[PDB]
């Protein structure tokens, strides 16, 4: 482009990054940031700042449940979001969100446990608790998540039946796939009946910080509305600076934290991701973390006004993260919508991915395209399903 | 002016440091001035700049294509025998890689084996994964073949699952004795003939002190990698604070490990910093570093032991490692631990003390020469032996 960027995608091939959609898709697929926004240069700068600012430190084992400059500002930052404290012995380092879920699928659950979770809901998270030898039970919900009633109904009869549910699984924020956020009074709700059976909930916050709507922010976090009783709230710097980083955090109140900070894992290794985290460090210090989410957040923000533009078979537009969530209300079933898809060659994410659904839903991604781009695949999405 | 500097490696940054005044030769950590802090600054700016926005999206789920393919190339050269990139899984460091094995490859109450002194640090992940841990019988080349068929044997009679045998056959952790060839052989076929995983944690591998010396070749070689699963590190060559390693297995057992959500979900396990390693492997640069590193790590394990011979009479033996970090001091004839503990605080000196590896005949005390520069170590040295004396 126009200014100095490093975000190129010379190596962006198989064998390198994850996946790669074959040749000729427009990829609405995955919920990835698109290439040229990948903060690249920053994250160059921050290795550097870090290395000469921490020196040898920055190559050391580090402190067990990460680096104290960071606990401190991460605990700051959820409590300027909650409006609710949070001090920095609840914080706790990650290696991403991915690693966080096979710890605790590992560590505060037991192959055979159930893990209840909403009809809908990450799909890939869903694969960590099975290959842990989890059992998975959907519990209904509706456009604001999961249901209180059904949740409760869910734990008595899992106790009737003698069958241990070691957590439930929540993303209350921007949902994936469907967009949605919880909003305070179900929150509340929620965690009552999950107190009274005293079953943690593992709340898993990805898109925390992507609200688009400017000066909005989602509702306080499960884990802060209950004080951190009983709840483990997962974070992650994957969709904000790049998954590729393998950085995340954890915030629980200060007895699991403190546990889950003396199992061997930590006690051996140290900090899960020492280097890059002091050099995330540096960014969360310097205020170049925030201005690159002020940059980021106008970016999805166009992307997704863009495809919703286009496209305007129901939408409800959500209020931050990567995605849409295409309900059809005709009837059309998800095999003759990918049909189309496919037709248009448009790569787009179907429903039955994340569990059960009201009819047809399809989840399109705006976080991996340009505006033009993805204007350019709605057209031929509607042309094949005209 | 050097980037290996100090002036953060304090409480709340770094892992732990000692009581100001003490002489550390507890951990085995990097001396912080030998620390590649300029190598690795310049491998990120390389590797961003020319990986761009591929080193910040998600990894290939076992580990970007490029390090799988050198990281194959140094075993089969190490160990004069083949290994293909798909028998490589990259880790964020073996302390991970340990746990997914010990709750994958495991089930809560399954046993390992180990020797009768091992890997402190690994029992703790193992103990904390709840499996049981059962010591095996060893000698001055590790574990003994005899003892580990009566171990496997007296299990299985009790239908207590053995879910692997945990080994460190080079530059062990404490002993610092490297397992020869012979030794290696019988133990892959007692077993063998049990089938029963051999998990062989190899973080010293890179760390021959004799410049023109090598180890045998690993366990999982010899078994044509049937069987065992070799763990490799950067932590003991570049820097643990990386945290990043990798994972030698055969094709099956890296790819079946491979599709596991945790893989899918996060992809490569620690892509960016795997990214600024492999420009090192690529050029050279880390080799040229192994070679600089080694011979500073020579010197330190030169110097500590040369300040130690005064001590080394009656009973009080130190067989010099080949390599690693580590010297293994054996007591015995009634020398007790705490008494020799209570001589290094008098002399403010920091040991480990071998209770925590496990059970020795009489003391063990280990001494870690890669923490500090010659001189130091020798006052350490000199400290001890007065304090002992």
């Given at each position: ?27 609405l697929g ?89 009809e809908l809901?990450?799909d ?53 796939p469907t967009g ?131 496209l305007?078979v129901e939408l409800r ?6 995605f849409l969530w295409l309900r059809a209300g005709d009837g059309a079933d998800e095999r003759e919508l990918l049909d189309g898809a496919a037709?248009a060659?448009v790569?787009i994410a179907a429903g039955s991915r994340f569990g059960t659904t009201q009819g047809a839903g399809l989840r399109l ?16 999405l509607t042309?094949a399903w005209s």
């Amino acid at each position: 482009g126009s200014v100095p960027s490093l975000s190129h995608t010379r190596q962006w091939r198989p064998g390198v990054v994850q996946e790669v959609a074959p040749a000729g898709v427009l990829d609405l697929g995955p919920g990835y940031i698109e290439p040229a926004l990948l903060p690249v240069r920053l994250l160059r700068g921050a290795y550097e700042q870090a290395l000469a600012e921490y020196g040898a430190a920055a190559l050391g084992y580090g402190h067990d449940p990460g680096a104290q400059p960071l606990r401190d500002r991460l605990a700051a930052r959820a409590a300027a979001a909650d409006g609710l404290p949070c001090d920095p012995d609840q914080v706790l380092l990650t290696s991403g969100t991915s690693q966080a879920l096979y710890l605790l699928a590992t560590s505060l659950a037991a192959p055979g446990d159930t893990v209840l979770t909403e009809e809908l809901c990450y799909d890939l998270g869903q694969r960590i608790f099975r290959d842990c030898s989890l059992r998975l039970r959907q519990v209904a919900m509706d456009g604001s998540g999961m249901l209180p009633d059904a949740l409760d109904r869910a734990l008595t009869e899992g106790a009737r039946a003698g069958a241990k549910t070691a957590f439930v699984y929540l993303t209350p924020t921007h949902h994936n796939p469907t967009g949605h956020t919880m909003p305070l009074a179900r929150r509340r709700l929620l965690l009552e009946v999950a107190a009274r059976h005293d079953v943690l909930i593992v709340e898993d916050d990805a898109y925390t910080e992507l609200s688009l709507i400017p000066d909005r922010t989602p509702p306080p976090s499960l884990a802060a509305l209950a004080g951190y009783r009983r709840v483990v709230r997962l974070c992650s710097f994957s969709k904000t600076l790049g998954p590729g980083l393998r950085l995340g955090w954890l915030l629980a109140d200060r007895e699991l934290a403190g546990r889950l900070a003396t199992h061997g894992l930590f006690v051996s290794g140290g900090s899960l991701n020492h280097t890059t985290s002091l050099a995330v460090s540096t960014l969360l210090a310097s205020g170049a973390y925030d201005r690159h989410l002020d940059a980021f957040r106008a970016q999805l923000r166009a992307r997704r006004d863009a495809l919703v533009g286009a496209l305007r078979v129901e939408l409800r537009t959500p209020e931050g993260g990567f995605f849409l969530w295409l309900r059809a209300g005709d009837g059309a079933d998800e095999r003759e919508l990918l049909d189309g898809a496919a037709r248009a060659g448009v790569r787009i994410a179907a429903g039955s991915r994340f569990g059960t659904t009201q009819g047809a839903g399809l989840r399109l991604a705006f976080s991996f395209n340009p505006p033009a781009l993805l204007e350019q695949a709605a057209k031929r999405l509607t042309t094949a399903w005209s």
